[PDB]
Assembly symmetry: C4
Homo-oligomer: 475 residues x 4
């Protein structure tokens, strides 16, 4: 280690001491602080323009359910059904009649589509379409029954009248019926153009009223769906982008700064890998076998690859965010996960700046020496944790509601060891103290042996390992 | 210990070192890993075929309550009652009339039983049957009252009409009335034969509408019950078991592998007990009294007896699971507990493989040296815990709802020390700050002295014992 | 300490070694174990006979509210009111009319009182009585208003008809009205005489329908109350006490055993105080000042005074429990607290028997050396805890519901540091983000600075003191 | 340090030893104990007079909603809306008609205002006023739309009749409509003058029924507001202040004692700063550089500046509390925060008296040596905590309700790591397992990685730092 002392210790420096190392004037770190401001402001003024459009989306549907569903009070979304045969007729007819009488009874001023799509013939806007099997004769007590999947879409066409038909003539064939759907579309004008100060968006909803009968169980649920397909509406007017282009040319700063930091930080990655070739031979091997691909690991800094990671996502995110002016994408999920996961991972990079101080390094490196020991034991618990998830899903599965699928059992058990919704699950078992009294006595032994296992002997390790690691770092 | 060194140290080995011990090629452990795949897949494809039949069971009843109970909205299962005398007449008659008019008003296409059982004469399908005392004259203010239990079942017979009677003529004798029941049966065809791709099941429900009056309290609850008695329905058709026997001959692999592992693991149990006779005398006793029936305990390995235990349950479980093709059992509880408790106890056997590594052994043996000290102290707490359960059941028993039986008090207190449903129980006491103000002041002193006892001086031991044991294992 | 070695070490012995001390055959401890069986069985068969009578009490009232209150659905107990002036007339008249027509419309077979009490003239059973001021002329915009408390009870008398009056002629004088009450009584026969196998109880309810108007706020609540005054009903019949006196002469065993143990244990108290006079002078004082009234404290054993305490309560409790055959007391609170607090304090005496073993003594004496240090710090927290209770009661008092009285704030805060009903109280503040936006910003700073104080710096002491005490006891 | 030994050690004394220092008779500390009684009694008898007026305020509104809102049942405050066009007409007309018929149908005896304010012409009491745009022609499918904010207030005037008009003639112009408001006022007399024993307050409510349509979404919410403007009512009567001035001249004791303590405690502040000039030079500097502005910090006692702080707030608070007799302020927030924050901060001053004992000093100074290390690490967590708040607000923002604004996300996450409302947020995500199945899989990974981070590796530090600090203070 004679002549490589100066260059291999420059790589192990800190910008508190780089200032007095060779006089570097470290703006190569200060640009990373600009991301903390610019990406978050890119994020916050993306969220507020998106939130205000969601409340317009999720409140016209609440308007539509009080106009298109017969007897719908509030709250009962998923428990709204039709049980008789004439409850199903009055539900269908009331949904059509309000559509034919929309500008007289409803406020809000919608207007019809006069569409040209696939489940509509030309002129037609509303179409109620049955679905039933091709040929099928099911009959209990004479069990000569034929089932062949071949569904026929019998649509009934109706267009809205222009100025102030035979759909009432309708049979349904219930013993073969699959589902009855209703399709229509409605344009409108958003009228929140005042706090935007300029020309607003212009919507087109797409309603699907669904009379679904899959289970053939004598109970038909009733649903409603919308998709706000947004595009701009026709105008020859001007003066809109006096301030609007001051948002349209802000993401170009995000395009600049994250890319210019993607250039800068990777050059250090280019520097660190380049300086590996010299330490390998290094005296025409003297020690030789001491380099072992884990002593190679402390060359590439883990903070930089995290800063490279966000900048891949961030400039991929904001280039997708450009698709709000004229691009026909409604991909409000892919553009949203990329921006949030960047900001979730940009802000954790601040902890690096806290480790430059001699006090805060103790608490963070306490996590670093203990993150192995927790992640070892977290595998020891997850094996037992998957044991109770498969056992509780079969025994307590048929009789209850919370324990029906694995994605609920892994939630109803995991929310239970922290101490939440515990008495409610004990109270739901005691509708079975008469009905099948073995399953009750298993459920008392299942639940008590689980909640008194993870708090009293598993949670205590996670307190003991960190205490056991905090003694090592300071002595 | 001269000549027994090699054989008594082979028994204390590990399959990480058995490979270099004598060249054994340890497939005698790899067969145990096959259970992890086969039993779980035996479990998961048992659950999904069982779940889909439960949702058909628990949704035809929800259909039946909206057809057979007068004025039943959703949610109010247990608080649905009839209070006047004419609420009870209109509830009975509406339950019969919908039965006589089922194919005209209900969708789902049920059909009648035309039964031959015990609470039905021949031809009859529906039977409403009173229950009242033989002779009894209760009268307040003239208390010459006779009570002798001798109940008479007065049934009224009615059969459904074939093509498009005197039950309206009915008296009830309320001062002697016990309960009025209604029995009928309905066959149907499940029509979820598409994702099964073959001939579906064919059900027969059994409805019991119960007008129960036990307490004679001027309030009659109303109930409904079903039991889906399933059997196959008549067909001369074929092509069903092109893929269905590929489930019917999968459990035979579970029959093979768990049994072949029941043969293998017990041979080591046969080996361990056989090698006990030599260590007893062992030098025509030299030490003699040192063997003390607890130094005998570390011979039989505790992991093997757990692997024997599941294989008893597993091949007993899956042989009961064969009763789904043609066996008339509906025993969906006994066959379910055995399979789940096996899988709960098969998956914990994976922890043995984690103890072969030098890191994971530390965390597990920390539990093993601390499982005595916790189970000592768990007896010290349960004595005090049963103290508050008997004290709170008498004082707070009459005035409240959660504290009515011991099986609720042992739930309402145990869910309370973890911190769940705590404010709701404090809020329920304050309907008694005027009504009997001593019981209120006891309830503030009962609850505060209990929740501030188990968190602050009992939960702290369970954190202290594990920390106190983690120092011993690593130093 | 020459000649007092043998007698002063006999007093420091254990019954594990008293057997080999002088051959005592320790039945003077085994009688204390008899209490564990006898008092608990005295308790459990007191609770089950009491529980079954409460469900008859609290279900006839639920019957009465569905017969006597106009438009009462379930659940809405405390939010049932009458707002107009004709809602109050229809509520009163419907309550009288159902009383006049009770045997025709209600099941359950009640019967009238034909009473002779104070708010009833002779023959009369029902009495609706106004309450209003003597003389008062309140008038806004002409504020010459007189208020003098002198209330007049104007009752209207009505008796039930015998075989198949002017109360409809009624004015109420609302501007002076205080409350309108309705009183009647109803006898009945309990008919759960079958599982008792003998002659049942015979009740007399006392209904009070209350139209309370205290606040004069334009909103009158409506209430209902009962008191089941129980006594036996008339009979010349016999054969009741073939098994019933086998309960009536079981408490005499509780009278025996607790008293015979009250005699035995106090003789040791008589022995311990008697042996104090000798240690005082003890060598015509040698050390003298070393006895300091805290070294006197370890003479009288703390376990015995607890066993004396329960036996005072237990034989006082069960002698009050004798008042269920013929004594006219309804004191079901005083007799219940004494029995439960005994059993709560009898069962903690079992821990003494656990301290005879060398293992369990460590965990219990860990509590004993740490019970000072916790109770010191519990005073340090309660000072700060009363600080937030007075601060939160004034600021957040007017705007919310949970924070209205101190008895709720001491519950809503104490249930909050354990982690229960936390988000619901944060959600209730955000109806004030527009209404008085200073109180909102205080409420975010009030709640966050409190819940993040007691979990993160106060709960951690209670874990640290016990860990800090567990190291002292074992080293 | 020769001659300044006596004076610089008098400043480091305790009143347990000041009694034997120079014979001081320490009433200069006992006056501070008088505040504990006087301020709290000033607080409690302020709260009870304020609480009783709030329940009169918040129960006349509950009366008003059952009289002025068409079809308002209880509970549904924020979900009460009008969806058709004729639901809006029947809601307006029913609100006017009940106002015109108030003394005939309502109890409580209100009376009209006959007002003279700004949204009322002379004589008029009720005024329903539209709001709509000046000129605007919005039309979908012909998008020549004009929007200019210029709102016109078209009021309709109506006065109540004196002894036993054209507002029914009304159009609304819905396509331009903004909001319809209704204003009126009602005086009354509180009649809770009995427990006050003297002349009560005399109120004037101000009702605002709001038909708000901002979003133009086809859904109009309906609201109600009151402001109880209180002043005294006209009387020539006397005898009121026989006991009432015994409250009016109690706050003057609070004016005395807190001010006389503000004089006393600040003289010690005047003493401590005065004695700093001597320690600076102190030997014409010998050490010189050892004084470093943090060794200056232990001169001014931190307990006194807290006692100065409350006395600033307390005498500012109670001088604002004088504004309840005749001052027209309704500022019941500013006068309330000052009194509560004083009492919150007066009561923490009691801990100083606990530190005079040798036992309680250990627990408090354990907090003092650990309050740095917690507040260091609390910055390390809040950086990561703001990361998840920005990430969860965009991804889970559109699809759910709890995650809509940052002020809820900082509550829904912070209430979640303590273990409250955890399963309810997992259950709300599973309405999206079909709808946009990427956002579901992110939500399982978002929530699990957060709740299993702060309990298992962040909560454990807060237990480890206090344990790590409790070892330092006692060894
Ligand atoms: C000049 C010829 C003789 C050299 C003899 C002395 C060698 C000595 O002067 O050092 C090498 C020097 C420093 O530049 P390096 O990048 O090689 O080394 C580190 C830098 O201090 C920072 O990077 P930079 O500011 O350059 O972007 C950064 O703080 C670190 O990484 P990090 O903290 O993780 O970000 C490292 O990367 O390189 C060249 O001579 C630069 C030449 C000047 C720039 C020319 C163009 C304007
Ligand atoms: C006999 C004359 C010479 C005495 C010389 C030896 C003295 C030595 O033999 O000891 C004193 C002896 C023991 O009786 P004591 O009661 O004085 O001393 C303890 C007893 O062992 C237990 O009480 P006991 O069984 O009596 O109810 C009890 O275990 C302890 O208290 P505790 O564990 O807290 O419950 C102590 O109280 O007293 C008398 O001589 C008893 C005489 C025999 C009974 C006569 C009537 C049947
Ligand atoms: C007298 C001339 C020769 C002096 C030589 C001895 C000097 C020695 O006697 O000491 C100085 C003495 C004590 O008074 P000081 O205030 O200077 O010093 C402390 C006092 O013991 C308390 O304050 P006090 O009771 O006065 O309000 C208080 O306990 C402390 O502060 P704290 O505990 O934080 O509250 C300190 O402030 O001052 C003057 O001589 C007082 C003169 C008598 C009062 C005259 C008017 C009635």
């Amino acid at each position: 280690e004679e002549d490589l002392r100066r260059r291999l210790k420059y790589f192990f420096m800190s910008p508190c001491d780089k200032f007095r190392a060779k006089g570097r004037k470290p703006c190569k770190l200060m640009l990373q602080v600009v991301k903390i401001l610019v990406v978050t402001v890119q994020l916050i003024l993306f969220g507020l323009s998106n939130q205000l459009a969601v409340t317009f989306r999720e409140e016209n549907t609440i308007a539509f359910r009080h106009l298109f569903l017969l007897g719908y009070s509030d709250g009962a979304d998923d428990t709204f059904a039709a049980y008789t045969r004439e409850q199903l007729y009055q539900a269908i007819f009331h949904a059509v009649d309000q559509y034919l009488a929309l500008p007289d009874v409803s406020l809000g001023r919608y207007a019809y589509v006069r569409g040209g799509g696939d489940p509509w013939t030309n002129g037609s806007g509303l179409a109620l379409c049955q679905r039933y099997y091709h040929r099928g004769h099911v009959d209990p007590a004479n069990d000569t029954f034929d089932i062949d999947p071949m569904v026929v879409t019998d649509c009934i066409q109706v267009d809205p009248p222009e100025r102030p038909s035979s759909y009432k003539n309708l049979t349904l064939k219930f013993h073969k019926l699959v589902n009855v759907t209703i399709h229509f579309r409605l344009k409108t004008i958003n009228l929140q153009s005042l706090i935007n100060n300029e020309i607003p968006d212009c919507y087109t909803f797409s309603v699907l009223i669904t009379f679904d009968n899959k289970a053939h169980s004598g109970r038909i649920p009733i649903s409603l769906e919308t998709q706000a397909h947004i595009q701009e509406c026709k105008h020859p007017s001007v003066f809109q982008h006096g301030d609007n282009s001051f948002r349209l040319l802000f993401d170009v700063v995000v395009i600049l700064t994250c890319s210019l930091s993607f250039l800068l930080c990777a050059r250090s990655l280019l520097r660190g890998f380049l300086l590996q070739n010299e330490f390998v031979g290094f005296m025409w091997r003297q020690r030789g076998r001491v380099i072992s691909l884990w002593e190679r690991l402390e060359f590439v800094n883990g903070w930089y690859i995290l800063l490279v990671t966000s900048d891949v996502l961030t400039i991929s995110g904001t280039i997708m965010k450009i698709g709000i002016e004229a691009k026909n994408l409604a991909s409000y999920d892919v553009c949203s996960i990329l921006l949030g996961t960047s900001t979730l991972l940009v802000w954790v990079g601040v902890i690096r700046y806290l480790t430059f101080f001699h006090n805060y390094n103790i608490l963070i490196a306490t996590l670093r020496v203990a993150l192995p020991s927790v992640m070892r034991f977290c595998c020891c618990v997850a094996v037992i944790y998957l044991g109770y998830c498969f056992c509780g899903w079969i025994v307590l599965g048929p009789y209850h509601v919370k324990f029906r699928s694995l994605s609920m059992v892994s939630e109803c058990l995991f929310s239970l060891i922290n101490g939440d919704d515990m008495f409610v699950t004990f109270a739901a078992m005691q509708a079975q103290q008469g009905r099948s009294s073995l399953v009750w006595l298993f459920s008392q032994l299942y639940l008590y042996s689980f909640i008194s296992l993870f708090i009293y002997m598993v949670l205590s390790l996670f307190i003991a390992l960190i205490t056991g690691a905090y003694d090592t770092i300071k002595h």
